RNA sequence: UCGA
DNA sequence: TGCATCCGTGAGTCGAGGGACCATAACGGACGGGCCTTGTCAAGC
DNA sequence: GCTTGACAAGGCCCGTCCGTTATGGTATAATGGGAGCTGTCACGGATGCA
């Protein structure tokens, strides 16, 4: 299973994470001691949800459950036990795909990588001086212990504040002079004991309080130090903090997990002194053995911990004011601070991200992202060069290729294919045991938790092995202590289980990965997660074979579980019968809206009367073919330059891709309107709207709302809504115009929902959610109407297409089939790609892919080639050229392979009919269609809305915004002679309530006027500087007159 | 400041969209009316001294929030926008509204290569 | 208009109150903010003393005062004797500045905590 | 030592003052009660001494005037001692209120205003302690401070009792009706209409800030998506083009007929005039200006020389 | 977060 | 009078997306009748 | 080409009605606050510490 960091994490929270939080919260007491409240956390209910999975997405709700615990309220003096179940909070459940539904939108919880708790030592040179060793005891939650060591044998303890001597903390926790020196070399400790005095057990708590809290008190020094490291519910090492203390310092005690042991502070000082004696290891901060990951089971444990602490303040403020008895325990627990704590984590936190649902490849990748940012991780400004590079401990755990380019280059990683996280939070990799030069591929792997660095010798999965005898190679390259070396095959210990263990699940879909560059393989893995689901997908011919596993783990593929006989198959359900209440129904969704405006259509695959197996595809998804995944189409390609139509990364396609419904996707948009409550009068949805005739009232059913199946275009009316007005401030021009022809204006105003510019399609869902029907509504709303419009988009000029090797491009021309070049059998060419971008970017694998897919086209065999071989030069060139020779041995196909030029044939011109001078490489390429279509990039504005303060035009496609003329754009016009264009762009086009009126009136009348006025943004800055206490004004230097000018008035 | 430079509009749901200048102006007048109340009823001098210290901190947080003391917050845990924090930053009035503006009669689109054309000529939809 | 140079100086307390107090046909001036109230919760109209007051910064709507009875374009340039709001355009609100009279002096934070602390 | 936390500075000046005993609260209350009768005489004498009782001492009725100032200074020091020493009680009460609307600094200053009022109304003859009676006045001045401050569009004091009354009835209906809540059951037990309850829920909404980040980063704010309350220049330009065409059909009429339609609706003057004010500047009485405008509006409705005022109907 |  | 330590100042440009309680008196808008003020209708000077 | 009595329509004006709103009070005793900062790099002053 590829999703185990989400399913096993939420399963741990429902049985171990929720029980541990309620056991530490209980019991609580009052100020006097009259009654006590303790919970029973291990007997909670977790009742049934309210709505369905598909119903919660359209009703704008969350798939959540109610949490109830039994609560026993006892009293100290009077014997009474009050058992009652009290509501705790709303907990959203994880769906079957591993996601959550928050406010009708599907969301994921990205796993965040942080540092592991423990002690870490570091050699630091602050200046050109001696060698200083530092320390840092990091807990899971609480204060930090930073031990430093200066020159001349002075070890200090810093607990944010100023540093202090090591004897001050070591004596205040409770110790003797003989219990320190017996377990310490004590000759180095005499230099820090001379210039520190010699305090007793009570002569150190007073001096500790004088420097931390600057009167000292004998009772104040004990309450300050115990609350930092020794008090419960304020300092936590964690289950993994106790494990890292017993490994580094080699401690004998274990299973403490709550209180910091004072013997552990003595062991951290002893390891720091011995670092000057050239013994001990300096820890690394970028090592994956020191870096942990956490998931939904751990991140939810911190939100209930800060949510129950707010509940502890109200539970102690209600058992003291009410001095009377006979009170119910259900009124002591207020669920309001804990409901708002869970709702803030799932909807308002940064780590809960919007789920990418373009294709099943992006859904599987987004659940396995390893990001180093979040509330407790790193910062965008605090990220440096060392944290973004690849550590040598990332071999097989984190993918070195798949990472987003730009700002987050290296901070957001991806988990590898065979990687696995244990219960402690460390990434593990499987390895096969090698015994005396023989790979023992018979038993289960070892799953080493990054402990193979300083102990084991690990070989990758690329060495030639024999059939159970020995290893063929005499020099095996291995890795030992983060360095590569070639040793004997009898000296190795472990070997990798797969050659795709290093790369992730999205990089493994690229065939011939070893022939492509690592920079273009980064782009090829990112463009595969943006491919739209087509209308009829097609499986690739040069697939790697891992597409079948990624389709079943995405959750959008109906699988069988019963091993039965299929009875009834239609377009909505599949009914089988289980055998060794026997009729289950598998529902099939038809054209459901996704998050990225794509389709989630499922098609039936099986027929009636067929034996099935557990793990068989019953119904494939939208971007999924039969069994395996399918994100694009296999069509003909040719690497030849046309007449400037493929000049700089441009694509020339044919007309055959248009009328054959190739690269044709279905996009479903969703519109929203609401009949709110205006204080002047309630708004309602009517059909008789003013100033709109029969040109737009054709699809309404006398209710103001459109019908199902009506073709809407740009500028129509979906929901006709009116709004009452109470202005009554008519100008004298409109009063004279209305008095002539009559037709007195009504009190309503047309606020109908309309279709935006460049939008069309067919309406498929006109679901209306009103009150008194069984659904909750937001306050200040009478009727909520939701309109879903689906449209069928073909492939056009301006769309961005790409392949699996980073050869992205934008189509500039769609030629007919008689103008495209044609093969010597008469078959035309679909895509005419440019061969100039190939040798400059090292995209060699895309030439191996098309030449192998052309061999699979004439044979019809659908090759499955795994990456990272076999014999050198005999597995990539002679595989392609050897299989192209077999396709040429057919009696009908003799023109496929040539002896002089192997990977080339003769191509004829379509316009003139003459052959070209040189042979051209042809093949069957697998191209994808990305989400960056030409329809979403069109924006234009003449005059629209304006800003609130600066009175400048707004910015945005969805709100009719204007393009920003920034500071780099002024410097280009200032370097030109364009002074009148610069004054026009800053005055009459932005921030002038007077200059915009006269400039617009000049074009309609036909006589332009010069000299625009003062812009509004300068007068805002003039009033802001006067409010800062600065007498700033503008004057005139005219003859015998120095007067201030009034820019505002 | 004039009230249009600290605008108070109402959203569609009924909530008001106030500015951070209104919360910093209200802290000055609430601590100034309390100081005039304590000086009238002959308050103890330990309360008048503490009231004048908070009046000193209210104006300094209004001018430059976080310059001398701690940064005051509101409902959300972000920093409040003072009078000086709207002109010095990258998102201030100088670098986002004076040197660079959003212009009218503008638009954008993706570009494709046009052959069989000339220079000083572009394709416009 | 057209200006030739911009000069910046330290604002005296007689200069800050010059922007605040405005001439009104009455006995006293009303251009001082004394209350922290902005608007009303029942109606969307401001109060007669506050940060959004109409007697200090001007009328909220065009040619309409706060109390009523002056909601026409006929009255231009007069002040209502019942309320005190000048009947003029609504664009005058972004040009008028009030003032807050303090009960204790307060040092400026730019001159004290600045570099190199010109107050010290 | 130098520090920056102003709450730590004020808490150090509180702890430097010794607390009062049980017998010292009775002693200081007698001088405050002696100060109550001293200010009541001055409040009764200021209505007949031209509001200037600086030397008018009715309590004495060089040695008597010096002893009167000694008793006035000693009585004001007793009220100075009772409020200053009981400042630890204000911190213990205001620490349970520093989460709703105000900070911890503003609650101690508002709670100290209730400690002054508790010192004047403290009656030592009843026998109760000072900490029992002053708790009712510190908690009253803190709760009144959240009702009057800590909100931009502030709500009255009686409205906060109405919101707290709905929250007690909704919790009451949750015990009787365990599932399926509604809004009509809450308005029935409150004896109010269904339209008043929508006004309570709208006024109880907290205001949002204009500079809050609406995304996952600090790239955009809330003020970038909010339109201004102003008319677009497309309606202000065509308003000027309406003057060029409305005055075109008026120049073809009579000069007497054009003068009636301009001053009536408010053209070329900025002010609307009635029918009687046009009749007083002319030598012709009523019922002529009405039938002239009835004749002027009749000829403009005919399809003759008025074809440009056809698509102006909005 | 994602494109150049 | 020179050497450490701390604090304040900077760190690319565009576009898309999503997102406590109660009692009592003062204050003010709503409702209703009276009073001119204003628009309209049919003949008659 | 103008003029006069008649018939309602409606805006202010001035009373009261009751919801709304500002203000003061309650008596066992109660007496110093929480919530993060701990992985950025470079330069320029300003203390301060010998
Ligand atoms: Zn008025």
From Swiss-Prot, chain A:
GO cellular component, one term: DNA-directed RNA polymerase complex
PROSITE patterns, A to Z: RNA_POL_BETA (PS01166)
A Gene Ontology molecular function term of the record: DNA-directed RNA polymerase activity
Keyword Nucleotidyltransferase: yes
Listed name of the protein: DNA-directed RNA polymerase subunit beta
Function (record text): DNA-dependent RNA polymerase catalyzes the transcription of DNA into RNA using the four ribonucleoside triphosphates as substrates.
SUPFAM superfamilies linked to this entry: beta and beta-prime subunits of DNA dependent RNA-polymerase
Source organism (scientific name): Synechocystis sp. (strain ATCC 27184 / PCC 6803 / Kazusa)
Reactions mediated catalytically: RNA(n) + a ribonucleoside 5'-triphosphate = RNA(n+1) + diphosphate
Keyword Transcription attached: yes
Curated annotation (Swiss-Prot), chain B:
Similarity section: Belongs to the RNA polymerase beta' chain family. RpoC1 subfamily.
Name of this protein: DNA-directed RNA polymerase subunit gamma
Domain of life the protein comes from: Bacteria
Assembly notes: In cyanobacteria the RNAP catalytic core is composed of 2 alpha, 1 beta, 1 beta', 1 gamma and 1 omega subunit. When a sigma factor is associated with the core the holoenzyme is formed, which can initiate transcription.
Parent-record interval covered: 252 to 376 of 626
Role noted for this protein: DNA-dependent RNA polymerase catalyzes the transcription of DNA into RNA using the four ribonucleoside triphosphates as substrates.
Swiss-Prot record, chain C:
Source superkingdom: Bacteria
Residues reported in the UniProt entry to bind Zn(2+): 65, 67, 80, 83
Protein's job: DNA-dependent RNA polymerase catalyzes the transcription of DNA into RNA using the four ribonucleoside triphosphates as substrates.
Protein family according to the UniProt entry: Belongs to the RNA polymerase beta' chain family. RpoC1 subfamily.
Subunit structure comment from the entry: In cyanobacteria the RNAP catalytic core is composed of 2 alpha, 1 beta, 1 beta', 1 gamma and 1 omega subunit. When a sigma factor is associated with the core the holoenzyme is formed, which can initiate transcription.
UniProt name for this protein: DNA-directed RNA polymerase subunit gamma
Residue span relative to the full protein: 7 to 126 of 626
Swiss-Prot record, chain D:
Region ranges (Sigma-70 factor domain-3): 161-236
Motif Interaction with polymerase core subunit RpoC in this chain: 106-109
GO cellular component: cytoplasm
Region (Sigma-70 factor domain-2): 82-152
Superkingdom, natural source: Bacteria
Ranges where the record places region Sigma-70 factor domain-4: 249-302
Biological processes, Gene Ontology terms: DNA-templated transcription initiation
Chief place where the protein resides: cytoplasm
GO MF annotations in UniProt: DNA binding; sigma factor activity
DNA-binding region, residue range(s): 275-294
Sorted UniProt keywords: Cytoplasm, DNA-binding, Sigma factor, Transcription, Transcription regulation
Cell location: Cytoplasm
Functional description taken from the UniProt entry: Sigma factors are initiation factors that promote the attachment of RNA polymerase to specific initiation sites and are then released. This sigma factor is the primary sigma factor during exponential growth.
Family stated for the protein in its record: Belongs to the sigma-70 factor family. RpoD/SigA subfamily.
Subunit structure: Interacts transiently with the RNA polymerase catalytic core.
Protein name: RNA polymerase sigma factor SigA
Species of provenance: Synechocystis sp. (strain ATCC 27184 / PCC 6803 / Kazusa)
Parent-protein start and end of this portion: 67 to 425 of 425
């Amino acid at each position: 299973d590829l999703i185990e960091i989400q399913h096993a994490s939420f399963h741990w929270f429902l049985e171990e994470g929720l029980i541990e939080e309620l056991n530490s919260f209980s019991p609580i007491s009052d100020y006097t001691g009259k009654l006590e409240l303790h919970f029973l956390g291990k007997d909670y209910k977790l009742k049934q949800p309210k709505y369905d999975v598909d119903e919660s997405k359209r009703r704008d709700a969350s798939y959540s459950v109610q949490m109830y615990v039994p609560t026993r309220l006892i009293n100290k003096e009077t014997g009474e036990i009050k058992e009652q179940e009290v509501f705790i909070g709303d907990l959203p459940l994880m769906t079957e795909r591993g996601t959550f539904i928050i406010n009708g939108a599907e969301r994921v919880i990205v796993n965040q990588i942080v540092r592991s708790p423990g002690v870490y030592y570091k050699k630091e040179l602050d200046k050109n001086g001696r060698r200083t060793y530092s320390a840092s005891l990091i807990p899971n939650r609480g204060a930090w212990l930073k031990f430093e060591t200066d020159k001349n044998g002075l070890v200090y303890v810093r607990i944010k504040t100023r540093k202090l001597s090591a004897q001050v903390l070591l004596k205040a926790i409770g110790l003797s002079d003989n219990e320190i020196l017996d377990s310490l070399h004590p000759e180095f400790y005499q230099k820090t004991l001379d210039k520190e005095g010699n305090p007793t057990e009570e002569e150190a708590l007073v001096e500790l309080y004088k420097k931390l809290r600057p009167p000292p008190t004998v009772s104040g020094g004990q309450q300050l130090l115990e609350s930092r490291f020794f008090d419960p519910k304020r300092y936590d090492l964690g289950r993994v903090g106790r494990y890292k203390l017993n490994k580094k310092l080699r401690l004998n005690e274990a299973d403490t997990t709550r209180v910091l042991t004072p013997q552990d502070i003595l062991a951290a000082i002893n390891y720091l002194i011995n670092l000057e004696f050239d013994v001990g290891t300096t820890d690394d901060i970028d090592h994956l053995g020191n870096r942990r990951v956490r998931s939904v089971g751990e991140l939810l444990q911190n939100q209930i911990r800060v949510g129950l602490n707010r509940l502890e303040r109200i539970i102690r403020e209600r058992m003291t004011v009410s001095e009377s008895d006979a009170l119910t325990p259900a009124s002591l627990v207020n669920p309001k601070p804990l409901v708002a704590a869970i709702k803030e984590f799932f909807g308002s936190s940064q780590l809960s991200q919007f789920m990418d649902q373009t294709n099943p490849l992006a859904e599987l990748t987004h659940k396995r992202r390893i990001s180093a940012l979040g509330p407790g991780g790193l910062t965008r400004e605090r990220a440096g060069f060392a944290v973004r590079d690849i550590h040598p401990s990332h071999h097989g755990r984190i993918c070195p290729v798949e990472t987003p380019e730009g700002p987050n280059a290296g901070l957001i990683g991806s988990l590898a294919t065979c990687a696995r996280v244990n219960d402690y939070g460390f990434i593990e990799t499987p390895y096969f045991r090698v015994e005396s030069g023989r790979v023992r591929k018979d038993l289960d792997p070892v799953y080493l938790t990054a402990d193979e660095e300083d102990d084991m010798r690990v070989a990758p999965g690329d060495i030639p092995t024999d059939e159970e005898g020995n290893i063929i190679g005499e020099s095996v390259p291995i890795r030992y202590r983060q360095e590569f070396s070639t040793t004997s095959p009898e000296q190795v210990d472990y070997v990798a289980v797969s050659p795709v263990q290093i790369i992730s699940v999205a990089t493994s879909m690229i065939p011939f990965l070893e022939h492509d560059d690592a920079n273009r393989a980064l782009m090829g893995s990112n463009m595969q997660r943006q491919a739209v689901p087509l209308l009829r997908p097609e499986r690739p011919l040069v697939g790697t074979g891992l597409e079948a596993q990624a389709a079943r783990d995405s959750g959008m593929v109906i699988v069988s579980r019963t091993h039965g006989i299929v009875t009834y198959v239609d377009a909505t359900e599949i009914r089988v019968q289980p055998h060794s209440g026997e009729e289950i129904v598998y529902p099939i969704q038809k054209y459901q809206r996704s998050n990225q405006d794509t389709c989630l259509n499922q098609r039936p695959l099986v027929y009636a009367g067929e034996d099935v197996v557990p793990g068989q595809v019953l119904a494939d998804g939208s971007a999924t073919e039969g069994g395996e995944l399918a994100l694009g189409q296999n069509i003909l390609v040719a690497y030849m330059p046309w007449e400037g139509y493929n000049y700089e990364d441009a694509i020339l396609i044919s007309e055959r891709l248009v009328y054959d419904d190739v690269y044709t996707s279905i996009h479903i948009e969703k519109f929203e309107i609401e009949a709110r409550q205006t204080k002047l009068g309630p708004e309602e949805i009517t059909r008789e709207i003013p100033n709109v005739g029969e040109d737009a009232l054709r699809n309404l059913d006398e209710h103001g709302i459109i019908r199902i199946g009506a073709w809407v275009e740009s500028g129509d009316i979906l929901v006709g809504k009116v709004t009452p007005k109470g202005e009554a401030d008519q100008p004298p021009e409109e009063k004279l115009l209305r008095a002539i022809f009559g037709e007195k204006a009504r009190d309503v105003r047309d606020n109908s929902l309309r279709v935006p510019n460049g939008e069309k399609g067919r309406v498929v869902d006109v679901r209306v959610f009103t009150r008194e029907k069984g659904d909750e509504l937001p306050p200040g709303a009478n009727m909520v109407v939701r309109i879903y419009v689906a449209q069928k988009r073909k492939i056009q000029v301006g769309d961005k297409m790409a392949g699996r090797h980073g050869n992205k491009g934008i189509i500039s021309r769609i030629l007919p089939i008689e103008d495209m070049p044609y093969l010597p059998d008469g078959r035309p060419i679909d895509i005419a790609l440019n061969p100039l971008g190939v040798p400059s970017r090292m995209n060699v694998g895309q030439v191996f892919e098309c030449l192998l897919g052309w061999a699979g086209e004439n044979l019809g065999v659908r090759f499955k080639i795994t990456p990272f071989d076999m014999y050198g030069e005999e597995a990539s060139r002679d595989t392609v050229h050897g299989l192209l020779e077999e396709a040429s041995q057919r009696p009908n196909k003799d023109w496929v392979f040539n002896e002089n030029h192997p990977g080339k044939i003769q191509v004829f011109d379509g316009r003139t009919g003459e052959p070209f001078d040189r042979p051209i490489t042809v093949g069957q390429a697998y191209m994808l269609k990305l989400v960056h279509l030409v329809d979403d990039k069109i924006h234009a504005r003449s005059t629209g809305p304006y800003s609130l303060v600066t009175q400048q035009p707004l910015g945005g496609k969805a709100q009719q915004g204007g393009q920003r003329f920034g500071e780099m754009e002024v410097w280009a016009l200032e370097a030109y002679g364009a002074a009148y264009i610069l004054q026009e762009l800053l005055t009459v086009k932005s921030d002038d309530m007077q200059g915009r009126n006269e400039a617009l009136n000049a074009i309609v009348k036909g006589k332009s006027i010069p000299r625009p006025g003062t812009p509004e943004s300068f007068k805002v800055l003039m009033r802001e500087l006067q409010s800062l206490g600065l007498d700033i004004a503008a004057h005139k230097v005219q003859l015998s007159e120095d007067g201030e000018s009034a820019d505002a008035e | 400041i004039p009230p249009d430079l600290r605008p108070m509009v109402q959203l569609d749901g009924g909530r008001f969209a106030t500015s951070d200048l209104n919360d910093l102006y209200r802290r000055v007048i609430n601590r100034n009316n309390r100081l005039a109340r304590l000086q009238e009823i002959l308050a103890p001098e330990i309360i008048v001294r503490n009231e004048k210290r908070m009046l000193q901190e209210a104006v300094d947080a209004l001018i430059d929030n976080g310059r001398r003391g701690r940064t005051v917050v509101g409902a959300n845990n972000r920093a409040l926008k003072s009078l000086s924090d709207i002109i010095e930053g990258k998102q201030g009035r100088f670098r986002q509204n004076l040197l660079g503006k959003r212009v009218d009669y503008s638009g954008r689109s993706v570009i494709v290569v046009g052959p069989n054309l000339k220079i000083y000529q572009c394709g416009l939809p | 208009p057209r200006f030739d140079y911009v000069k910046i100086a330290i604002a005296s307390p007689e200069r800050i109150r010059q922007w605040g107090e405005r001439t009104l046909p009455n006995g006293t001036v009303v251009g001082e903010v004394t209350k922290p109230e902005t608007i009303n919760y029942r109606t969307l109209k401001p109060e007669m003393d506050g940060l959004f007051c109409e007697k200090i910064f001007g009328p909220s709507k065009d040619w309409e005062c706060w109390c009523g009875k002056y909601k026409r374009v006929r009255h231009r340039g007069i002040v209502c004797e019942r309320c005190g709001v000048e009947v003029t355009e609504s664009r005058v609100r972004r040009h008028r500045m009030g003032y807050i009279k303090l009960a204790a002096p307060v040092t400026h934070v730019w001159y004290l905590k600045g570099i190199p602390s010109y107050l010290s | 030592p130098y520090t920056e936390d102003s709450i730590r500075i004020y808490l150090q000046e509180i702890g430097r003052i010794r607390l009062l005993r049980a017998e010292e609260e009775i002693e200081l209350a007698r001088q405050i009660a002696d100060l109550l009768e001293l200010e009541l005489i001055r409040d009764n004498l200021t209505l007949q001494l031209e509001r200037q009782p600086s030397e008018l001492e009715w309590g004495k009725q060089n040695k008597n005037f010096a002893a009167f100032r000694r008793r006035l200074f000693l009585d004001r020091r007793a009220k100075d001692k009772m409020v200053q020493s009981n400042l630890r009680l204000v911190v213990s009460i205001a620490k349970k209120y520093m989460n709703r609307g105000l900070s911890f600094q503003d609650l101690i200053q508002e709670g100290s205003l209730g400690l002054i009022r508790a010192a004047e109304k403290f009656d030592h003859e009843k026998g109760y302690k000072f900490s029992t009676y002053a708790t009712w006045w510190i908690r009253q001045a803190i709760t009144r401070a959240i009702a009057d401050q800590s909100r931009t569009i502030r709500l009255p004091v009686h409205l906060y009792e109405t919101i707290s009354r709905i929250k007690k009835t909704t919790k009451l209906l949750s015990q009787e009706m365990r599932r399926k809540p509604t809004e009509e059951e809450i308005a029935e037990k409150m004896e109010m209409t269904i339209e008043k309850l929508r006004f309570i829920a709208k006024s109880a909404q907290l205001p949002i800030s204009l500079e809050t980040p609406i995304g996952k980063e600090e790239d955009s704010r809330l003020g970038d998506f909010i339109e201004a309350d102003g008319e677009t220049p497309e309606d202000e330009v065509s308003k000027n083009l309406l003057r060029e065409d409305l005055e075109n059909v008026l120049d073809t009429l009579s000069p007497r007929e054009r003068d009636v339609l301009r001053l009536r609706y408010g053209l070329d003057d900025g002010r609307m005039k009635t029918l009687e004010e046009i009749g007083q500047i002319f030598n012709v009485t009523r019922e002529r200006i009405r039938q002239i405008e009835a004749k002027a509006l009749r000829k403009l409705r005919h399809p003759n020389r008025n074809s440009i005022l056809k698509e102006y109907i909005r």
